[PDB]
Structure 1
Amino acid sequence: KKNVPHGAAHIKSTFNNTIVTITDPQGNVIAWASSGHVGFKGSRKSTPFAAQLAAENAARKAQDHGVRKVDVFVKGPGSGRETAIRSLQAAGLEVGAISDVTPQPHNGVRPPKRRRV
């Protein structure tokens, strides 16, 4: 039982999963359905189909709380990074602007060693 007409959509799309969270413009979360929350598991969580399913779930759960328009912030080297936006669009929401907020260090912390697979 809330009512936030305008909100923000954060889409974190990694190589292993995707998480969509809907917040008010102040950073308080409304709904957050993710790829594992939708029925999926394992390596299927990285497929674009799972991403768009999670986007639909989150969009409708937020509409139930009263959101009509969301600004989009995407980050991560994922594959559902655009399919989630398309599902947010064609699940009853208008997005408008889209931002890229992938964190970029200024040559800071040492990364883990390269996989010898």
Structure 2
Amino acid sequence: KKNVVAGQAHIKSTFNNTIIAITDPSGAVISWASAGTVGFKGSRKSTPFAAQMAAEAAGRRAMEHGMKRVDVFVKGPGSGRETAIRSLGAVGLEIGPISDVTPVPHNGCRPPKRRRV
């Protein structure tokens, strides 16, 4: 529809799945994907291959929306971060300053209780 050219990427990879959001540098999201959106569901949507699929799908849809090289910010203690980075590279668009936008409390709020598995 509209050519945004520059854009940027947000790669939120948690212990449960991976979410990729291609957005206008104004912050408005242009396209998005996740392991749940591209097929996988449940435990098997935490795999790096699921992040691969979701990242390439989001990149492709941003491409037919007309979006060139990306500045990427990654966040979360997931496993699909790098793999999604490669996926964006493979679909093909220049990747810039991989960030570390993941948050970190200064103690702050109390974390939930330790699991007793």
TM range (shorter): over 0.9
Equivalent residue letter for 1:39: G
Q: Does residue 1:30 correspond to 2:57, yes or no? A: no
**TM-score (normalised: structure 1):** 0.98
Equivalent residue letter for 2:66: G
In the TM superposition, what are the counterparts of 1:1-117 in structure 2 within 5 Å?
A: 1-117=1-117
Q: State how far apart, in whole Å, the 2-side matches of 1:72 and 1:96 are.
A: 7
Deviation at 1:97, TM superposition (A): 1.3
Deviation at 1:33, TM superposition (A): 1.2
**TM-score (normalised: structure 2):** 0.98
Deviation at 1:94, TM superposition (A): 1.3
Deviation at 1:92, TM superposition (A): 1.8
Superposed CA deviations along residues 13-43 of structure 1, whole A, max 9, x for unmatched, are: 0000100000011101100011100001111
Q: State how far apart, in whole Å, the 2-side matches of 1:33 and 1:111 are.
A: 29
Equivalent residue letter for 1:16: N
Q: Counterpart of 1:9 in 2: which secondary structure?
A: strand
Equivalent residue letter for 1:68: K
Superposed CA deviations along residues 35-74 of structure 1, whole A, max 9, x for unmatched, are: 1000011111110000000010000000111111111100
The two structures, once aligned, show a CA RMSD in angstroms of 0.6
Q: Counterpart of 2:109 in 1: which secondary structure?
A: coil
Flag as ranges the 4+ runs of structure 1 deviating above 4 A.
Answer: none
Percent identity over paired residues = 79
